Amino acid sequence: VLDLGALGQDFAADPYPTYARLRAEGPAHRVRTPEGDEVWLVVGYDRARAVLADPRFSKDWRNSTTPLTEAEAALNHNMLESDPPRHTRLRKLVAREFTMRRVELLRPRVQEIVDGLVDAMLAAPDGRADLMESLAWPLPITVISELLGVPEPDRAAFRVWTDAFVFPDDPAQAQTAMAEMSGYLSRLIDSKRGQDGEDLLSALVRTSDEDGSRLTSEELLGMAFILLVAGHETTVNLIANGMYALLSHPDQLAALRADMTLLDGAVEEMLRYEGPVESATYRFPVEPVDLDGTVIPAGDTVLVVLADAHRTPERFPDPHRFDIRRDTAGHLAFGHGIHFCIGAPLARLEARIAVRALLERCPDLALDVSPGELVWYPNPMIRGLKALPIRWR
Ligand code: HEM
Ligand SMILES: CC[C@H]1OC(=O)[C@H](C)[C@@H](O[C@H]2O[C@@H](C)C[C@@H](N(C)C)[C@@H]2O)[C@@H](C)C[C@H](C)C(=O)/C=C/[C@H]1C
């Protein structure tokens, strides 16, 4: 059992050599997370993509031998932690809200949010700012809160709970945040009842109240929860990891500046090169699964290392090169299979507008620290920075 916690911040800042060393030995490996959990790692692009869509690897915790606390189980009835037919039923309820054509209707508002955030950032007299606090945090939480009807005075506490899910000071802090967020979301759901709101949460409340078999009260809470959480840390870190990739590769930043039509491909390579999802969410084999002689027993926890899949040289030649013109087709930053990210059009819209605004409105935009001075969070599932100091003229 490889102890990942004994590797320190070096593994948090640069986990790729560790994953690559494992991939040379095999596709499946028993590890111990820095937090102390014994899980399986699936490495290698071909194996990673296959396991993500393999129905033998369930996402329902009824198939897991890991126990859930009361706070964890209260938020567990969501589409990401379900199999068919429950997953099919839950995703159908909101699939129309997140299509490309429906998300495109949010472009004027997303552009307005980015414009105002860049306005306040450019007001700095020294021309310096933390891109995390100035743009990477507020943009996604503002977009998803307006969509789901989360009032502004409640959004600050929502980020604190999210922070406790990724980098808790102690395991009890993560449990308290889950219990507090569940209590808040239930109160928020109750506040929509009978108010004739037209936000997404108001519509879900009416759907659940009209037919509890189509959306139970537990699944109503789980739906609000997963829609608000699954896209927060990921979108925040895509903007930050992507801008870090651009600013730490000046040749690519200048190429994008000279030809802004490469914007969409650059964002795709940001997902490929430094995607926010280091490893996919929990998967449990319903039966023993043989992966090239390595048998993963039923009920064990399996983490698909998307970060290693994106550095497999047979799939992405010269994998450690950040190339905004690279053929990025087939990356797993949004997953693969029935659980493929429902928010991918919205995430791409937010990232594309944010990156374009920073390049067009920050003359001589630059990383205000050395790459070695940046600090990465030690979470096996999320790849994200503590801060992104930047400067401009
Ligand atoms: C940078 C942006 C994003 C990235 C990299 C990302 C990544 C992912 C990945 C990898 C999965 C599948 C996880 C697995 O199979 O274990 C997923 C699923 C999901 N994502 Fe995202 N996501 C992003 C943005 C968003 C946003 C903004 C929302 C909210 C509207 C969202 C909502 C969801 C939901 C609800 C699922 C579960 C889908 C299902 O199980 O069918 N995501 N995402
Ligand atoms: C796009 C998927 C995001 O993943 C999540 O939202 C996962 C499911 C959630 O994972 C875990 O959160 C813990 C607080 C409890 C845990 N469970 C085992 C009791 C649950 O599965 C995130 C909230 C946690 C990670 C750190 C995260 O923020 C990642 C977000 C996306 C990858």
PDB file of all heavy atoms in Angstrom, residues 206-226, unseen atoms left out:
ATOM      1  N   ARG A 206     -41.594  22.551  -6.672  1.00  0.00           N
ATOM      2  CA  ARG A 206     -42.927  22.264  -7.192  1.00  0.00           C
ATOM      3  C   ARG A 206     -42.991  20.868  -7.799  1.00  0.00           C
ATOM      4  O   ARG A 206     -43.989  20.156  -7.633  1.00  0.00           O
ATOM      5  CB  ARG A 206     -43.330  23.323  -8.220  1.00  0.00           C
ATOM      6  CG  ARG A 206     -43.721  24.661  -7.602  1.00  0.00           C
ATOM      7  CD  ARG A 206     -44.400  25.576  -8.613  1.00  0.00           C
ATOM      8  NE  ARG A 206     -43.465  26.057  -9.623  1.00  0.00           N
ATOM      9  CZ  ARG A 206     -42.709  27.139  -9.490  1.00  0.00           C
ATOM     10  NH1 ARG A 206     -42.756  27.886  -8.398  1.00  0.00           N
ATOM     11  NH2 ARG A 206     -41.882  27.477 -10.474  1.00  0.00           N
ATOM     12  N   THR A 207     -41.932  20.454  -8.500  1.00  0.00           N
ATOM     13  CA  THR A 207     -41.893  19.106  -9.059  1.00  0.00           C
ATOM     14  C   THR A 207     -41.989  18.058  -7.956  1.00  0.00           C
ATOM     15  O   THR A 207     -42.770  17.104  -8.055  1.00  0.00           O
ATOM     16  CB  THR A 207     -40.613  18.912  -9.878  1.00  0.00           C
ATOM     17  OG1 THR A 207     -40.659  19.746 -11.042  1.00  0.00           O
ATOM     18  CG2 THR A 207     -40.465  17.457 -10.311  1.00  0.00           C
ATOM     19  N   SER A 208     -41.210  18.231  -6.887  1.00  0.00           N
ATOM     20  CA  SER A 208     -41.228  17.271  -5.789  1.00  0.00           C
ATOM     21  C   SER A 208     -42.565  17.287  -5.058  1.00  0.00           C
ATOM     22  O   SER A 208     -43.103  16.227  -4.715  1.00  0.00           O
ATOM     23  CB  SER A 208     -40.084  17.565  -4.817  1.00  0.00           C
ATOM     24  OG  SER A 208     -40.125  16.688  -3.704  1.00  0.00           O
ATOM     25  N   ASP A 209     -43.117  18.477  -4.807  1.00  0.00           N
ATOM     26  CA  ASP A 209     -44.397  18.564  -4.112  1.00  0.00           C
ATOM     27  C   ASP A 209     -45.536  18.003  -4.955  1.00  0.00           C
ATOM     28  O   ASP A 209     -46.496  17.451  -4.407  1.00  0.00           O
ATOM     29  CB  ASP A 209     -44.691  20.014  -3.728  1.00  0.00           C
ATOM     30  CG  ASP A 209     -43.774  20.525  -2.634  1.00  0.00           C
ATOM     31  OD1 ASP A 209     -43.006  19.717  -2.069  1.00  0.00           O
ATOM     32  OD2 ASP A 209     -43.822  21.737  -2.339  1.00  0.00           O
ATOM     33  N   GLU A 210     -45.452  18.134  -6.282  1.00  0.00           N
ATOM     34  CA  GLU A 210     -46.516  17.623  -7.140  1.00  0.00           C
ATOM     35  C   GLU A 210     -46.518  16.101  -7.196  1.00  0.00           C
ATOM     36  O   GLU A 210     -47.586  15.487  -7.311  1.00  0.00           O
ATOM     37  CB  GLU A 210     -46.378  18.203  -8.548  1.00  0.00           C
ATOM     38  CG  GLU A 210     -46.919  19.615  -8.694  1.00  0.00           C
ATOM     39  CD  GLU A 210     -46.685  20.189 -10.078  1.00  0.00           C
ATOM     40  OE1 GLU A 210     -46.538  19.399 -11.033  1.00  0.00           O
ATOM     41  OE2 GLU A 210     -46.648  21.432 -10.208  1.00  0.00           O
ATOM     42  N   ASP A 211     -45.342  15.473  -7.119  1.00  0.00           N
ATOM     43  CA  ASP A 211     -45.253  14.015  -7.185  1.00  0.00           C
ATOM     44  C   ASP A 211     -43.969  13.599  -6.467  1.00  0.00           C
ATOM     45  O   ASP A 211     -42.881  13.684  -7.043  1.00  0.00           O
ATOM     46  CB  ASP A 211     -45.273  13.526  -8.625  1.00  0.00           C
ATOM     47  CG  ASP A 211     -45.569  12.040  -8.734  1.00  0.00           C
ATOM     48  OD1 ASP A 211     -45.249  11.293  -7.786  1.00  0.00           O
ATOM     49  OD2 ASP A 211     -46.120  11.619  -9.774  1.00  0.00           O
ATOM     50  N   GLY A 212     -44.114  13.141  -5.221  1.00  0.00           N
ATOM     51  CA  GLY A 212     -42.968  12.709  -4.442  1.00  0.00           C
ATOM     52  C   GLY A 212     -42.259  11.495  -5.002  1.00  0.00           C
ATOM     53  O   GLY A 212     -41.099  11.253  -4.652  1.00  0.00           O
ATOM     54  N   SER A 213     -42.927  10.723  -5.859  1.00  0.00           N
ATOM     55  CA  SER A 213     -42.278   9.584  -6.498  1.00  0.00           C
ATOM     56  C   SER A 213     -41.376  10.003  -7.652  1.00  0.00           C
ATOM     57  O   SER A 213     -40.460   9.253  -8.008  1.00  0.00           O
ATOM     58  CB  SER A 213     -43.328   8.584  -6.991  1.00  0.00           C
ATOM     59  OG  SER A 213     -43.803   8.931  -8.281  1.00  0.00           O
ATOM     60  N   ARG A 214     -41.611  11.177  -8.242  1.00  0.00           N
ATOM     61  CA  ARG A 214     -40.724  11.671  -9.289  1.00  0.00           C
ATOM     62  C   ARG A 214     -39.483  12.337  -8.711  1.00  0.00           C
ATOM     63  O   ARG A 214     -38.412  12.287  -9.327  1.00  0.00           O
ATOM     64  CB  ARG A 214     -41.475  12.644 -10.198  1.00  0.00           C
ATOM     65  CG  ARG A 214     -42.727  12.054 -10.827  1.00  0.00           C
ATOM     66  CD  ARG A 214     -43.263  12.939 -11.938  1.00  0.00           C
ATOM     67  NE  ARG A 214     -42.376  12.967 -13.094  1.00  0.00           N
ATOM     68  CZ  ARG A 214     -41.728  14.045 -13.513  1.00  0.00           C
ATOM     69  NH1 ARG A 214     -41.840  15.205 -12.887  1.00  0.00           N
ATOM     70  NH2 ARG A 214     -40.947  13.957 -14.587  1.00  0.00           N
ATOM     71  N   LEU A 215     -39.606  12.955  -7.533  1.00  0.00           N
ATOM     72  CA  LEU A 215     -38.465  13.580  -6.866  1.00  0.00           C
ATOM     73  C   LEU A 215     -38.791  13.609  -5.373  1.00  0.00           C
ATOM     74  O   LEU A 215     -39.608  14.423  -4.936  1.00  0.00           O
ATOM     75  CB  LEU A 215     -38.202  14.976  -7.409  1.00  0.00           C
ATOM     76  CG  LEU A 215     -36.988  15.732  -6.860  1.00  0.00           C
ATOM     77  CD1 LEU A 215     -35.704  14.991  -7.184  1.00  0.00           C
ATOM     78  CD2 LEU A 215     -36.945  17.148  -7.418  1.00  0.00           C
ATOM     79  N   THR A 216     -38.164  12.716  -4.612  1.00  0.00           N
ATOM     80  CA  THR A 216     -38.415  12.671  -3.180  1.00  0.00           C
ATOM     81  C   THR A 216     -37.797  13.885  -2.492  1.00  0.00           C
ATOM     82  O   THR A 216     -36.969  14.603  -3.060  1.00  0.00           O
ATOM     83  CB  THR A 216     -37.860  11.384  -2.569  1.00  0.00           C
ATOM     84  OG1 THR A 216     -36.439  11.490  -2.429  1.00  0.00           O
ATOM     85  CG2 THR A 216     -38.194  10.186  -3.448  1.00  0.00           C
ATOM     86  N   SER A 217     -38.220  14.117  -1.247  1.00  0.00           N
ATOM     87  CA  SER A 217     -37.682  15.241  -0.488  1.00  0.00           C
ATOM     88  C   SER A 217     -36.187  15.074  -0.248  1.00  0.00           C
ATOM     89  O   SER A 217     -35.435  16.057  -0.253  1.00  0.00           O
ATOM     90  CB  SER A 217     -38.432  15.388   0.836  1.00  0.00           C
ATOM     91  OG  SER A 217     -38.204  14.271   1.677  1.00  0.00           O
ATOM     92  N   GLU A 218     -35.736  13.833  -0.043  1.00  0.00           N
ATOM     93  CA  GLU A 218     -34.304  13.577   0.071  1.00  0.00           C
ATOM     94  C   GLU A 218     -33.587  13.878  -1.239  1.00  0.00           C
ATOM     95  O   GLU A 218     -32.503  14.472  -1.242  1.00  0.00           O
ATOM     96  CB  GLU A 218     -34.061  12.125   0.483  1.00  0.00           C
ATOM     97  CG  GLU A 218     -34.213  11.850   1.967  1.00  0.00           C
ATOM     98  CD  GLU A 218     -34.092  10.373   2.291  1.00  0.00           C
ATOM     99  OE1 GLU A 218     -34.610   9.549   1.509  1.00  0.00           O
ATOM    100  OE2 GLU A 218     -33.475  10.036   3.323  1.00  0.00           O
ATOM    101  N   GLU A 219     -34.176  13.467  -2.364  1.00  0.00           N
ATOM    102  CA  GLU A 219     -33.562  13.728  -3.661  1.00  0.00           C
ATOM    103  C   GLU A 219     -33.648  15.202  -4.033  1.00  0.00           C
ATOM    104  O   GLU A 219     -32.781  15.708  -4.756  1.00  0.00           O
ATOM    105  CB  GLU A 219     -34.221  12.865  -4.735  1.00  0.00           C
ATOM    106  CG  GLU A 219     -33.971  11.372  -4.567  1.00  0.00           C
ATOM    107  CD  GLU A 219     -34.986  10.523  -5.308  1.00  0.00           C
ATOM    108  OE1 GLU A 219     -35.962  11.090  -5.844  1.00  0.00           O
ATOM    109  OE2 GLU A 219     -34.804   9.289  -5.360  1.00  0.00           O
ATOM    110  N   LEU A 220     -34.682  15.902  -3.558  1.00  0.00           N
ATOM    111  CA  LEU A 220     -34.757  17.345  -3.761  1.00  0.00           C
ATOM    112  C   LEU A 220     -33.597  18.048  -3.072  1.00  0.00           C
ATOM    113  O   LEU A 220     -32.956  18.931  -3.656  1.00  0.00           O
ATOM    114  CB  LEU A 220     -36.097  17.874  -3.248  1.00  0.00           C
ATOM    115  CG  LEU A 220     -36.294  19.390  -3.176  1.00  0.00           C
ATOM    116  CD1 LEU A 220     -36.079  20.032  -4.539  1.00  0.00           C
ATOM    117  CD2 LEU A 220     -37.682  19.717  -2.642  1.00  0.00           C
ATOM    118  N   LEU A 221     -33.308  17.663  -1.827  1.00  0.00           N
ATOM    119  CA  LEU A 221     -32.136  18.193  -1.141  1.00  0.00           C
ATOM    120  C   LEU A 221     -30.852  17.774  -1.848  1.00  0.00           C
ATOM    121  O   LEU A 221     -29.935  18.586  -2.016  1.00  0.00           O
ATOM    122  CB  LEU A 221     -32.129  17.723   0.314  1.00  0.00           C
ATOM    123  CG  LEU A 221     -30.809  17.803   1.083  1.00  0.00           C
ATOM    124  CD1 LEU A 221     -30.393  19.247   1.279  1.00  0.00           C
ATOM    125  CD2 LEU A 221     -30.934  17.093   2.424  1.00  0.00           C
ATOM    126  N   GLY A 222     -30.772  16.512  -2.273  1.00  0.00           N
ATOM    127  CA  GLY A 222     -29.581  16.052  -2.970  1.00  0.00           C
ATOM    128  C   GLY A 222     -29.361  16.749  -4.297  1.00  0.00           C
ATOM    129  O   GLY A 222     -28.218  16.940  -4.720  1.00  0.00           O
ATOM    130  N   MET A 223     -30.446  17.140  -4.971  1.00  0.00           N
ATOM    131  CA  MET A 223     -30.312  17.807  -6.260  1.00  0.00           C
ATOM    132  C   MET A 223     -29.798  19.232  -6.093  1.00  0.00           C
ATOM    133  O   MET A 223     -28.926  19.675  -6.848  1.00  0.00           O
ATOM    134  CB  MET A 223     -31.648  17.800  -7.001  1.00  0.00           C
ATOM    135  CG  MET A 223     -31.620  18.546  -8.329  1.00  0.00           C
ATOM    136  SD  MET A 223     -30.865  17.585  -9.661  1.00  0.00           S
ATOM    137  CE  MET A 223     -32.054  16.257  -9.837  1.00  0.00           C
ATOM    138  N   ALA A 224     -30.320  19.962  -5.112  1.00  0.00           N
ATOM    139  CA  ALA A 224     -29.841  21.313  -4.837  1.00  0.00           C
ATOM    140  C   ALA A 224     -28.372  21.268  -4.436  1.00  0.00           C
ATOM    141  O   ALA A 224     -27.576  22.115  -4.843  1.00  0.00           O
ATOM    142  CB  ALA A 224     -30.677  21.965  -3.744  1.00  0.00           C
ATOM    143  N   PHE A 225     -28.025  20.256  -3.648  1.00  0.00           N
ATOM    144  CA  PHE A 225     -26.697  20.087  -3.151  1.00  0.00           C
ATOM    145  C   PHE A 225     -25.709  19.811  -4.282  1.00  0.00           C
ATOM    146  O   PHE A 225     -24.668  20.538  -4.400  1.00  0.00           O
ATOM    147  N   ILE A 226     -25.992  18.811  -5.110  1.00  0.00           N
ATOM    148  CA  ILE A 226     -25.050  18.413  -6.150  1.00  0.00           C
ATOM    149  C   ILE A 226     -24.918  19.496  -7.223  1.00  0.00           C
ATOM    150  O   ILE A 226     -23.835  19.694  -7.771  1.00  0.00           O
ATOM    151  CB  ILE A 226     -25.441  17.044  -6.770  1.00  0.00           C
ATOM    152  CG1 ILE A 226     -24.237  16.406  -7.468  1.00  0.00           C
ATOM    153  CG2 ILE A 226     -26.621  17.172  -7.729  1.00  0.00           C
ATOM    154  CD1 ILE A 226     -23.086  16.092  -6.536  1.00  0.00           C
TER     155      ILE A 226
END
